Design a protein around this ligand. Structure first.
Ligand code: PTG
Ligand code: PTG
Lengths: 263, 274
C-alpha cells in the first residue's frame, strides 16, 4: 500500500505547515540570505538584548511589570512563554495525525504530556545553527556565545542543545521529513500511564513506514538515514532529562501570583 | 531475488553471528533452553532467599566470583562484588567480539577505546536480557537462577540495581530476538560515531551504515511477519541509555554509602567522565 504512505506523508506535511508558523525552510533562508531581504535583529550582547525588547518588541513575554529587573531571568521567562505557544501548536498538529483523536482521551493527554519536549527540541533545531538561534517569529537571532555569556545556571543551559542541534541538522531533514518524524514521537507507546498501547503502536507503525519511505525518496542519496534519525531519539530523551534537572537547580533561585500558575 | 549487493551483506551477518558464538559462551539459545526447563540435565539451582543463598554457594560452581574475602558480612554486597567481576569479564568478551567487526581494528587506536567505553554497557544490558525472564536471571552461566524478588530486597541501595534491567528485559525480550539478530545489533551499538570525543568519526559511520544494512536485511529475512522490527529495535537503544545513565547514578551514591567497597579500575575508567 505504498500509495497510502505517500498520501499520509502529504497530509501530515500539509498539517505541519498550518500548525507551525516558522517552517524549517523559512528558518533556513533567514540563517543565510533570502531573508525576504528583511534581516533579523541580532541580539549579541546586553545592549543588543535591551534594545531587542523594543525593536522586535517581543513584549508579549517581556511585558509583566513587578519582576523584569534581572536580564537572564527575563530571557528564561521568555523561553517559557514561547514554549507555551508551541505546546498548543503541537497539540493542534497532533490532532491532525490520523487515529489520534480516536484514542482514549486520557492517552491523548498522556502522549502529548510526555512528548512535547522531545518535539520542542527537535524543532528548536530547525531554528538554530552552530552560532545562533532565531527568536520571536524569526525576527530576531540570539547568539550562541551570548547565551553562555549568561551567568548562574543560565550560562550553560542552551549549550547542551546547540550541540544537539548541530548533530541533528547534519541529517539535513526538511519539513516534509519532520512532519512525519514528529508524528512518530507523539505516537510513542512507552509513555508511562498509557491505557491502550495497541492502537498507539499500530499508528506509530504506519507512521514509521511513511517516514522510511519519505526518507528513501527525499534522499535516495543518503543511505540508512531512517536509521540514524531513529537513533537521534536517544539524544533527545537524554537531553530532555538533563534540562529537567537544571530546572531543579534554577529552583535555588527566586522567580507574579498568577504567572507560575499558568506555567 | 538475492541481488549481488544483498548477498554481500548476508556474508557479513553470518560472519558476525559466527564471531558472536565464538566469543560468548552463554548464547541466548542456550539460556532459553535452560530457563524454559526443557531439560533434566540443564536445571538451574534457584536462589530466592538467604537459605538457598547459602544452598547455592554450596551447590553451584563458585571459584570466588567475589575474590579473596571471607563472607563480607553482607549478602547484598557479596552478590555485588560477584556481579562486578562478572562484568569485567563481559567487557573482555565484548572486546574480543569487537575485534572481529570488519574495519574495527583498522581504526585509530584512541577511537577503538572510546567506541567500547560507551558501547560496553549498552551491550551488557542487551545481552543480560537474554539471561532474564519476568521472574529472574541466570548466574554462573546457566547453573543458577536468582529470583527477581530476592534481588529487589537485597537492601538500601543494593535492592535497586536490578529493577531497570528486568524492566527493559521483559520489553526487549518481547521483540523475540535471536542470537544471529543480536550479533548484528550489538555490532551497530559499538560502531556509534555519536560517541563523544571520537577523533575520526567518518570511518565509524561508514562501517555502521553497513552494520545497519546487515541488520535491516537480517531482521526482514528472520522475521517476515515482524512489522517494522528494524525500527522498533533501534528505538530500544534509548532504553539502553537510561539504564546505563541511571546505573552511573546509583554507583556514585554507593561510592559514598559504603566506604569499604571497591569498584574496579576498568569499571571506573568506563564511568570516568562518562
Ligand atoms: C524553553 C525552556 C523550557 C520549556 C518548558 C519546560 C517544561 C518542563 C525550551 C528550550 O530551551 C528548549 C526548547 C524550548 C524553547 C522554546 C521554543 C522553541 C521554538 C521552536 C519552534 O516552535 O519553532
Ligand atoms: C550483575 C548481576 C547479575 C548478572 C548475572 C549473570 C552472569 C552470567 C548486574 C547486571 O547484569 C546488571 C548490573 C550488574 C553488572 C553491570 C555493571 C557493573 C557495574 C557498573 C554499574 O552499573 O555500576
Amino acid at each position: 500500500e505504498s500509495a497510502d504512505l505517500r498520501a499520509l506523508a502529504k497530509h501530515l506535511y500539509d498539517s505541519y505547515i498550518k500548525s507551525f508558523p516558522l517552517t524549517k525552510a523559512k528558518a533556513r533562508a533567514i540563517l543565510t540570505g533570502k531573508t525576504t531581504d528583511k534581516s533579523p535583529f541580532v541580539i549579541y550582547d546586553m545592549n543588543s538584548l535591551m534594545m531587542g525588547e523594543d525593536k522586535i518588541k517581543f513584549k508579549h513575554i517581556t511585558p509583566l511589570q513587578e519582576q523584569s529587573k534581572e536580564v537572564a531571568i527575563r530571557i528564561f521567562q521568555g523561553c517559557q512563554f514561547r514554549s507555551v505557544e508551541a505546546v498548543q501548536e503541537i497539540t493542534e498538529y497532533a490532532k491532525s495525525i490520523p487515529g489520534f483523536v480516536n484514542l482514549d482521551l486520557n492517552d491523548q493527554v498522556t502522549l502529548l504530556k510526555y512528548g512535547v519536549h522531545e518535539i520542542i527540541y527537535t524543532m528548536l533545531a530547525s531554528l538554530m545553527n552552530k552560532d545562533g538561534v532565531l527568536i520571536s517569529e524569526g525576527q530576531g537571532f540570539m547568539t550562541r556565545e551570548f547565551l553562555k555569556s549568561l551567568r548562574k545556571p543560565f550560562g550553560d543551559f542552551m549549550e547542551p542543545k546547540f550541540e544537539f542541534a548541530v548533530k541533528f541538522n547534519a541529517l539535513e531533514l526538511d519539513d516534509s521529513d519532520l512532519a512525519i518524524f514528529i508524528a512518530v514521537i507523539i505516537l510513542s507507546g512507552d509513555r508511562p500511564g498509557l491505557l491502550n498501547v495497541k492502537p498507539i503502536e499500530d499508528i506509530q507503525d504506519n507512521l514509521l513506514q511513511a517516514l522510511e519511505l519519505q526518507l528513501k525518496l527525499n534522499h535516495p542519496e543518503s543511505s540508512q538515514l531512517f536509521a540514524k534519525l531513529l537513533q537521534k531519539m536517544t539524544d533527545l530523551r537524554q537531553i530532555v532529562t538533563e534540562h529537567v534537572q537544571l530546572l531543579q537547580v534554577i529552583k535555588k533561585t527566586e522567580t507574579h501570583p498568577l504567572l507560575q500558575e499558568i506555567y
